[PDB]
Symmetry: D2
């Protein structure tokens, strides 16, 4: 019988040595990519701040915290923000920012915590509920459908909806999977939230099981600038996958998390979406108010 | 022809979702094991405090920080401490403690940083050097010997040596491998630093390649106290490996890192050691005062 | 740092012991599946015999031999047959049949050899060429496209073309992928060559990379008739992948292998085919007579 | 959760493509190595034939058939030989020899079959039992001890013993693990059965679990002659593992398979073994006669 013997179990750590896959090529380019989410768009800052001001929002939950980018902006702008994420490699970066800016009182008062959408209700005390829960940049699509029925999608989305105060707002988005599913090409860098300073090439694979689109996998080949001989760049690659959320399924899923007690509007890039307009958006943003 | 597709590359993270090996069975008992073995022994506290004080040490580098237990003791007793480690999954727990106690002025002053013994000089500013460097808990032995000659142990020990000020101390220990390599059994829980609440069994595997002990592997079977049926214990395993440093070679390796310019003593468990003494230590502590 | 020890290298065998993946769960249902699907259809026998006879074929190369079912039919009906395949695990079953029937003079004359389509010219002496080459059973589609351009299909088809004598035939088929790629469902057991006793379900996954169907994967759930409790069926899965050859491209690929010097016809199931005919084949059989 | 998607299950085959790991570097050198077992020693041929002649042996079972080397020699010498092995990669070579030599009547009458030592009794009809069962060249040591107690060793050895006719012979061997266990070096090419024409370097690893030697792993680096630039050789590597059978354990195990109803003699290289002679043998051969 063939035995394989690992030096240590997958998932364990040890004091003087880097964790399991922390310095592979894939993790190295990936770090350049997550650091390139820096340069937020004027449009983005303008839309989101205006939405939240117009509604009088003050406590806000960022449920896809990441490196802290969206959250750092709300802290700076005076909101009282709680930020959670299920990933520790990403939470490390937010945490580091809060420690650096500790002495600025608004950053001493920023709550970053671990939480999973599947167990949110128990990970995060709702309190009287928040004024706006945000889940933006196609964070949500990372979540696969393991069970084949979309039960896990329904559960994460209900819990997210459970953190909205009555009268409050959920702002959640997804990339345009309707376009991607029909050209087979997720085109690089047409991005409405941060301007990318890296050049990347994307290969898109779409897996369809029986007749249903089940996953979109993107291979990102990143030109890394200083890494050849006489100043030339190198190229390296990493991969990430997603659930291809179509606008109509998603609209059903999201209004179902509210039990139908919501108003619901869907924007196109930051502008309205009239189904059958010419302009094919890169991202659909849904803004739901709990009306009940 | 065969090919193997993965969702995402090994090493990358994403906002929705737990990181790659994080909620495996082995990472859950392992998390038990680092938590319910971080309650220090009075002997150790008194030993380590009296030594540092005895030599008039005030700035200390902990170069194998882990969850911070060693540094926390020292941060509390009013030393200026900087703690590094290479493992993010472990530093996570020291960082979190610093935050929760960020209101006590000593804890506001604790530096915790990423660094690796191999590049330690490029990662930590010694300046004129620290008063003591500590690498306790049998952490040096985590570093494998990947090129068959011990060039990586040499490099690491030299970079650790360099952080010590002239007249400063290096305190670095290792398990008694001499014994382990004769009995083939690293016995559980005879621990001099921390008091273990958890019941465990250990299987020890020793790998020998063209007659040199090259690695010792411990498989931990942790009894987990409420996981079974009628309050009965539930059980899980994890594994971790060590380089088996024998006292005589390690003694040579560590002198050679100060270029011979050092005074060296080896403690028995905390007691002094002489060959063939009746008492068999579980740990050899080496104390090296740097002459120049 | 992590390392992974194996007992023995991947690909090596040893006298004591079963070969590496041989008694897995998947190799056991798979063995069921190749056995209890090798009982040929009267339609096929009559179709294939009449064609060969009709053109006065006598030496035949089976270039996708497998367990030998196609060759055995022909060896019995008095043709001079040489059978090659690249898979040892499959050739094993043809070899064994040859031995058991080594006393019948036709079977003493059957050649069964290892060869690969890619190197086929270097592996099989055509001499002046064979009368017919056969590659039936949807075997050509096993060859993946690993360089993204179909250079390996081209090479393989050209080397198969070269074994055909001038005035000889190439008979090569493929499943109807056109249909599969629109319905997303390769339906079970509508098979024209062999009569299946076994009950199976098939999940079909289609992989598409920057808008080109690149692979179809079938997961077979085989109902195994006595494996459960009270004679109840026990169940196991295995998986196998295909390159989805569409009729029009395959038609171009196969002409191009004879340099255009060929006459080409495509049969519907065994019946002739015309576009938009009401009858939808499960298999397209291509018959190519080489002109020069 | 990370999915990994294979093209096909481990262990399945498919008509136009090589089986899973058949053309890796490891399998390529390994084939040069198994083909280098060619050049049987004069000493070997002389001893074995003389033993078997002196006992009047005629039906003989080779239970570690391999490529067929020992068996081909007994066929040629007139014995009535049945040869079994559990490995198909190796049985393929024997089988091919029998087909080549088919017309020589003694090779038409050679029975090669698949069998496992663990299920031997049911794989091979004993008949009235054989005159000599042979298991030579350290075939037996390939068999690991999965259960930790040597139950599997006891079972394979009992079944092997069950194929010996009363008055018949078992000739079975093992390398000198007592020497290997004490120098840590299985030295290359001191071989008493075939002269090796390949130059190989061996690295020996010994794994000890708790105090018991559990496995000896050999990395064979083979100088392959024509594989560099101007005629120079290349070097490639494969690995194989074994149970370190000590002479005294083995002597117990083997006489226990007979229930103690045996005579037992143990040879040194082909010559007698007096425990405490100077000459340290490379191989111990045991010859047991069933006396009962
Ligand atoms: C790092 S996240 C933004 C995080 C955000 N600041 C937050 O609050 O969650 C970037 C997202 O943009 C995605 N995206 C969709 N199509 C893209 C494309 N063609 N190129 C780059 N990113 C694209 C990535 O898949 C990823 O999910
Ligand atoms: C929680 S860690 C100690 C961390 C410490 N703060 C530092 O300086 O890195 C527990 C340590 O005890 C070690 N240990 C070694 N042998 C052991 C044994 N037989 N029983 C229990 N713990 C053992 C483990 O290898 C591990 O490195
Ligand atoms: C036993 S093999 C045929 C071997 C044949 N003697 C030859 O020429 O290679 C069975 C073949 O039927 C194919 N097949 C394709 N689609 C199928 C389906 N839907 N149901 C059953 N078999 C299917 C399998 O892929 C496999 O290659
Ligand atoms: C191919 S087998 C011989 C097969 C034999 N003709 C039969 O009847 O089974 C070769 C054996 O010699 C072994 N052996 C032991 N020590 C060796 C060494 N230092 N170098 C080479 N082979 C050695 C291999 O491990 C292997 O098990």
């Amino acid at each position: 019988v063939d035995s394989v013997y690992r030096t240590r179990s997958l998932g364990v750590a040890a004091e003087g040595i880097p964790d399991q896959y922390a310095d592979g090529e894939a993790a190295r380019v990936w770090q350049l990519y997550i650091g390139d989410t820096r340069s937020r768009t004027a449009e983005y800052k303008a839309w989101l701040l205006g939405l939240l001001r117009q509604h009088g929002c003050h406590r806000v939950l960022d449920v896809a915290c990441g490196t802290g980018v969206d959250s750092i902006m709300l802290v700076e702008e005076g909101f009282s923000v709680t930020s959670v994420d299920a990933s520790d490699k990403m939470l490390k970066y937010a945490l580091k920012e809060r420690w650096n800016r500790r002495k600025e009182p608004a950053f001493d008062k920023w709550v970053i915590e671990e939480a999973n959408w599947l167990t949110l209700d128990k990970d995060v005390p709702a309190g009287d509920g928040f004024d706006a829960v945000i889940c933006l940049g196609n964070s949500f699509a990372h979540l696969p459908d393991s069970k084949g029925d979309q039960s896990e999608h329904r559960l994460a989305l209900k819990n997210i909806a459970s953190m909205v105060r009555p009268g409050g707002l959920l702002v959640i988005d997804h990339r345009n999977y309707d376009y991607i599913l029909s050209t087979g090409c997720a085109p690089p860098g047409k991005n409405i939230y941060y301007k990318s300073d890296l050049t990347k090439d994307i290969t898109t694979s779409v897996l369809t099981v029986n007749n249903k689109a089940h996953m979109v996998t993107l291979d990102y080949t990143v030109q890394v600038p200083g890494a050849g001989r006489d100043g030339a760049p190198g190229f390296s690659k990493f991969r990430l996958s997603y659930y291809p959320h179509c606008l109509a399924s998603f609209t059903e899923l999201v209004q179902e998390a509210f039990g139908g007690r919501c108003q619901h509007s869907v924007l196109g890039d930051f502008k309205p979406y009239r189904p059958g307009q010419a302009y094919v958006p890169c991202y659909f943003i849904h803004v739901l108010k709990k009306t009940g």
